[PDB]
Design an enzyme around this catalytic site. Structure first.
Site, short mmCIF file in Angstrom:
data_model
loop_
_atom_site.label_atom_id
_atom_site.label_comp_id
_atom_site.label_asym_id
_atom_site.label_seq_id
_atom_site.Cartn_x
_atom_site.Cartn_y
_atom_site.Cartn_z
N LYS B 162 -58.48 -20.07 -108.46
CA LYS B 162 -58.97 -18.82 -107.94
C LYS B 162 -58.38 -17.74 -108.84
O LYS B 162 -57.16 -17.72 -109.07
CB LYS B 162 -58.50 -18.56 -106.52
CG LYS B 162 -59.26 -17.31 -106.00
CD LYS B 162 -59.29 -17.18 -104.51
CE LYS B 162 -58.00 -16.81 -103.82
NZ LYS B 162 -58.10 -17.12 -102.38
N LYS B 164 -58.31 -13.38 -109.74
CA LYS B 164 -58.59 -12.10 -109.12
C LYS B 164 -59.46 -11.27 -110.07
O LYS B 164 -59.26 -11.32 -111.29
CB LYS B 164 -57.31 -11.33 -108.82
CG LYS B 164 -56.79 -11.36 -107.37
CD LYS B 164 -55.98 -12.58 -106.87
CE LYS B 164 -56.67 -13.96 -107.06
NZ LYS B 164 -55.98 -15.05 -106.37
N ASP B 193 -61.81 -13.50 -106.45
CA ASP B 193 -61.40 -12.72 -105.32
C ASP B 193 -61.41 -11.27 -105.71
O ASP B 193 -60.74 -10.88 -106.65
CB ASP B 193 -59.98 -13.21 -104.87
CG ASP B 193 -59.52 -12.69 -103.51
OD1 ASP B 193 -60.06 -11.72 -102.97
OD2 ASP B 193 -58.58 -13.24 -102.96
N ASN B 195 -60.68 -8.87 -103.40
CA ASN B 195 -59.66 -8.19 -102.60
C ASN B 195 -60.04 -6.80 -102.05
O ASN B 195 -59.28 -5.82 -102.12
CB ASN B 195 -58.34 -8.05 -103.39
CG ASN B 195 -57.54 -9.33 -103.40
OD1 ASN B 195 -57.61 -10.06 -104.38
ND2 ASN B 195 -56.79 -9.74 -102.36
N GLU B 219 -65.02 -13.87 -102.93
CA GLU B 219 -64.13 -13.57 -101.81
C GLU B 219 -63.84 -12.08 -101.60
O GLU B 219 -63.55 -11.33 -102.53
CB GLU B 219 -62.82 -14.33 -102.03
CG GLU B 219 -61.82 -14.17 -100.91
CD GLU B 219 -60.63 -15.10 -101.13
OE1 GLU B 219 -60.81 -16.14 -101.76
OE2 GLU B 219 -59.55 -14.76 -100.65
N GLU B 245 -59.08 -14.24 -94.40
CA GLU B 245 -57.63 -14.13 -94.52
C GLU B 245 -57.04 -12.98 -93.73
O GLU B 245 -55.85 -13.03 -93.38
CB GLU B 245 -57.24 -13.96 -95.99
CG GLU B 245 -57.44 -12.60 -96.69
CD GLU B 245 -57.16 -12.66 -98.17
OE1 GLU B 245 -57.81 -13.44 -98.86
OE2 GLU B 245 -56.30 -11.92 -98.63
N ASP B 268 -55.96 -17.35 -92.17
CA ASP B 268 -54.55 -17.32 -92.55
C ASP B 268 -53.81 -17.86 -91.34
O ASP B 268 -53.96 -17.27 -90.25
CB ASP B 268 -54.15 -15.89 -92.82
CG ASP B 268 -52.68 -15.67 -93.18
OD1 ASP B 268 -51.85 -15.62 -92.29
OD2 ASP B 268 -52.37 -15.54 -94.37
N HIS B 295 -55.54 -19.99 -96.06
CA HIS B 295 -55.02 -18.91 -96.85
C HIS B 295 -53.52 -18.94 -96.66
O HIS B 295 -53.03 -18.72 -95.55
CB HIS B 295 -55.60 -17.54 -96.36
CG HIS B 295 -54.92 -16.32 -96.99
ND1 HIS B 295 -54.10 -15.49 -96.35
CD2 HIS B 295 -55.04 -15.87 -98.28
CE1 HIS B 295 -53.71 -14.57 -97.18
NE2 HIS B 295 -54.27 -14.79 -98.34
N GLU B 315 -55.51 -23.73 -100.08
CA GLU B 315 -55.09 -22.80 -101.09
C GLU B 315 -53.63 -23.08 -101.46
O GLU B 315 -52.74 -22.92 -100.62
CB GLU B 315 -55.20 -21.38 -100.56
CG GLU B 315 -54.71 -20.44 -101.64
CD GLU B 315 -54.71 -18.97 -101.28
OE1 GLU B 315 -54.47 -18.59 -100.14
OE2 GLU B 315 -55.01 -18.22 -102.18
#
Ligand SMILES: C[C@@](O)(C(=O)O)c1ccccc1
Ligand SMILES: C[C@@](O)(C(=O)O)c1ccccc1
Ligand SMILES: C[C@@](O)(C(=O)O)c1ccccc1
Ligand SMILES: C[C@@](O)(C(=O)O)c1ccccc1
Ligand SMILES: [Mg+2]
Ligand SMILES: [Mg+2]
Ligand SMILES: [Mg+2]
Ligand SMILES: [Mg+2]
Lengths: 357, 357, 357, 357
Positions: B162, B164, B193, B195, B219, B245, B268, B295, B315
């Site tokens: 994964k 970012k 991701d 975010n 994500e 998450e 999560d 997560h 993860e």
């Protein structure tokens, strides 16, 4: 140009003359965090936060003391500060105690802005100060004490009271309502608060009995996050379902109003995000055609509701009366905004020392 | 019969070998609260919580230390404890840091239950331990460092990484993805991701470019609470949108899945409510037909996913590797559950002392 | 490590002291299949299945005897076993008698797990044993016998009874309800069960008459698979519509709750998929805000409801009392869980021999 | 006037020349229950049921032998018989094996009615016999055997084949499809069956790759009871999603078609409820504008599809060819209905004796 130069917090646990009894527990003291936001202009903004239980008090103060570092030397610009804190607590989760802390800073920063410009907060927001009708908020007091406090409230000029219900049997709920109507007559407003204590079947059954007694609104009949369950209870009632004290941020209100969970809204100035969160909530309530009341924080709420297009009721529930001067007055059942810069909160410094945690 | 007899917490701030860089900031250290839950049976349950930023660390520890009073002398029965804490934090708001604290207690209490019965947590939950495929989670590292760490991960046996993204220009996002595909070949999984860094128009535009590159999932393209905006981005994509998450409790997941916000979910273990919250989330994911990943919290997540009907990916992101023994091993890109009572967390006591706050 | 080593089944047809008369027929005997699941640990799990009619009894036993081959030498891990049986009956159809057989194995396997760990099933599931309120379930008995059995039930301490209705005329339905209210007074719960006997127009008309008499719930007014028709009847009532005894698996409950077919749910432990299916159903009921009761299987249901967040009523209807020891007791209208490993079912071996088919 | 006078069943387990391999298992033999329904008119109706796995074979026969008692001496009136069996299995659950048994009786009773009136079943239903286009159904055979059987099928005159897919990698799925297209040319129909083996994300990804290869339909991409998940896969495709073989009764089809789960339907004559269930399914398919194909039971399906307004394809998959005379012929890829009273099933009595269980 005007910068924030410091943040100071003090945690007090203040005694309440009447403990707020609810169907899910009693709030016997008020755990408060008093906030002082210092500025380069030599004015100090003030606000307080309500922690609900002493269990969360020291944690909330600690959080604010650890956040001071990120706002010191930032411009005194609440809307810009809020966007920056939303972004910094991105990953952690900008809700719960973090959101409540950020709202205490917002509220103190708007009080400081109004002091920089020597104007009452309602005037800074572009509205005239007007009297706001208030109801007196009491608790799950049993028939006799809730009837005694309701007679006292009509004698001080209030035209509506809120009682707490959600007793083991529906009959105890109606007894309380009936004894109050008996004493205050058919003109008076009786609001009832279930404090999330019922499941949806139970709430449809009890609310249709209360509706036949003529209550003003039924407040949080089931779990607060269950917006769909509130819509299902509301769909079976003529009387309005009231909720909103537990929405954290305008984005939770937006989700509840979108599915039609309630016909009335009462945001909490701290949980909704302070003054910045209130202006946004107020725009939503106007478009969805929702009469909007306040929850707690009567001092700043009298200002915010005079600027709220669908303003409805102010909730009188004095949690900080012991440590602040009584600049907010009630006259003929209406809150009267003090003609003071900002919000009009003035610490009673030697009382604070008595309640310090 | 088995009672909780004490709760002890220690706050550490542990250095991370690679700082987790995201489009909205970098997590350079891991602020953790280590929890020890003592029981009358003479076994001690263990868990840790992740505070995301050091700003929230001392506050979260304080909260848990103030909550100890309400669970000491309660039976070691996690499902019954959770219902009681939900009820006590009724008025305050059972979300944010309060919910996260309650989940640390849940997780330690289930670890202690498995130690009382001398069984691995996955077996106590009624399932067999099985290897769970894992992906290696790296950060917004720029083209060269994210490509270097991706080659290292395929060499350790992982079949997916994964990265970012959410750079100023879409072209920087695709450069990173392309350089990784270049190095690891077309077989490998590349998850990306964002975010929460994009708005919905921007996310539709960037995600359709990334979809033409063949990524595994996209994500949290926009603000996490915006479930409707995620549904709008998802409706324009063939590639799955992944999120979860940041859901606090199964009730936030229920709301997102109800409006079809995503095709994949990754709760999560701490924010979803611990083991008790995970079993409930897992039942929801199965009925909505949602493949479910985890997560963080790799140690307990390897156990929870072996019991999750639509289990998808674990993860790997080792936040507590410095203060706990490596009982969780990765073999050929799969997490292998340790054959230890409970969850298999064993404190490295002299390391903890180095990181103490 | 603990493996299943054998499965033994015995078909009995046990006499019922009162034949369960319904608007669509009478259940005069209880056709049961008693299951013994042997393990390598030397403990034996126990459950029984209810075949409803003797016509399906030998077929259900035969099916379980032919399934023994696929679970012998499998680990004693109910959640893993269920996923494997779901997969093996993929093409055939994992519903009806096949699903019911798989649930008998699940229930015996969880009883055996609790015996391996010497713990009551409710404790293994992470909850405390608590008394569960129970109602006494009687049948379409005519005015006099249903009134006689209702007086007997209030004398044994029960606070609610369920009667069967769906007579040729609405007036016969109300006569029965009225004669029971007459005898037990206005405090008592009267639940009514139509057993799928009405069409939707007829059910709206009869249920609004019964609602004016004050019944607790109206159960399965129309064909059970017709979830939309139940939503249409429910939309016209203040009283809750109750259903769920006929859902096969959590996936049928998920479909009914999604369209809002009912305000109350009562899964059957066998048709919902055993303990594994019950935990999943319980998570769904909590998110949809549905109070959840049980149907039959009082011994395991007292355990499952103590672990069910929206637990509502236990149905007392003793179908296997003749062949099992009375370890489940009713005290002041509440079921009291026995303090025995597993579920607490103990065969009365010489009675079984009398009823053997 | 014409009464049913007896029911006789024989369970055979017949070898299949090619074992039907699917992504979830292989059907290596055909477990069949042959049914003889005797009447007062001296004619005997015939049908067979398919048990899918030998595990369910003896149980299904036992059930039919225990049901004989309720239909002997009832008029030979299939529509009236079906309503009575629906009602008797009210409480038990009129689905699964019980529904399948009731459908075997329906099918034999309509065969007997056509023999009483000396007319082909299609003519009794009010339609003309017409040739019905058929596709040849093969299994998860790997590239070479599925290509070999596909060339054989085009040589016997068929214009379409169905292959099974759902291999570990999408690339294996496309290899099989491509090798078949290679051999049969672009004119030929290639249908693909996933046999419920994928989750919804996976099914959207694989189906858009297959759609670029030009397949006729994609069949049961995910779990059959998940109608919403099929609608979500269908919404992302131009190629039709096909399903229906697993619907038990017209009421499950009604629920799937209501939410738009598929663009094509293929009821199974046994699971849909026999001839009575087929006429009802056919009316639904016409109103929802769904082309309707059959699943298995080619002998009665050639009759039922000639009476089906949106008739689409007949599935050739000969499960009972060993024990029945070949009265159904395929000519130029079309099934030709035999000009025989009823359905045209004639037992090969000495073969049956070889396969008897
Ligand atoms: C009763 C309440 O719900 C209200 O509406 O005032 C309330 C809740 C919590 C603290 C103070 C007041
Ligand atoms: C990058 C992240 O969103 C993830 O998915 O791993 C993440 C966020 C915050 C802390 C650690 C990891
Ligand atoms: C009456 C019933 O619907 C119930 O709810 O108890 C029931 C149906 C079938 C067998 C036993 C009980
Ligand atoms: C492959 C299948 O799904 C089909 O469509 O033919 C099928 C399933 C089960 C038995 C025979 C055929
Ligand atoms: Mg309130
Ligand atoms: Mg992430
Ligand atoms: Mg019933
Ligand atoms: Mg098929």
């Amino acid at each position: 140009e005007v910068l924030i130069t410091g943040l100071r917090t003090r945690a007090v646990n203040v005694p309440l003359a009447y403990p707020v009894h609810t169907a899910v527990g009693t709030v016997g003291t008020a755990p408060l965090v008093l906030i002082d936001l210092a500025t380069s202009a030599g004015v100090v903004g003030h606000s307080y936060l309500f922690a609900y239980t002493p269990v969360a008090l020291k944690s909330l103060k600690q959080l604010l003391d650890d956040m001071a570092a990120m706002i010191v030397n930032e411009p005194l610009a609440p809307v810009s500060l809020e966007a920056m804190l939303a972004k910094r607590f991105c990953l952690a989760g900008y809700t719960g105690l973090i959101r409540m802390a950020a709202a205490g800073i917002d509220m103190a920063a708007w009080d400081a802005l109004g002091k920089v410009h020597e104007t009452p907060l309602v005037k800074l927001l572009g509205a005239n100060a007007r009297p706001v009708q208030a109801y007196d908020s009491h608790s799950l007091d049993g028939v006799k004490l809730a009837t005694e406090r309701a007679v006292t409230a009509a004698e001080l000029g209030f035209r509506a009271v809120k009682t707490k219900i959600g007793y083991p049997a529906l009959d105890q709920d109606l007894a309380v309502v009936r004894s109050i109507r008996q004493a205050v007559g058919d003109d008076f407003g009786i609001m009832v608060d279930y404090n999330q204590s019922l499941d949806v079947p139970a709430a449809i059954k009890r609310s249709q009995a209360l509706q036949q007694e003529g209550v003003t609104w039924i407040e949080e009949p089931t779990l607060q996050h269950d917006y769909e369950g509130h819509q299902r209870i509301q769909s079976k009632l003529n009387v309005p379902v009231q909720m909103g004290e537990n929405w954290l941020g305008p984005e939770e209100m937006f989700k509840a109003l979108s599915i039609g969970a309630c016909r009335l809204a009462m945001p909490d100035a701290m949980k909704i995000g302070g003054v910045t969160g209130w202006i946004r909530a107020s725009a939503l309530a106007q478009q969805f055609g929702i009469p909007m009341s306040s929850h707690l924080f009567q001092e700043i709420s009298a200002h915010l509701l005079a600027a709220t297009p669908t303003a409805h009721w102010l909730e009188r529930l004095d949690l900080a009366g012991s440590v602040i001067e009584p600049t907010l007055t009630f006259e003929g059942g209406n809150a009267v905004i003090p003609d003071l810069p900002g919000v009009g909160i003035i610490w009673r410094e030697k009382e604070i020392g008595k309640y310090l945690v």
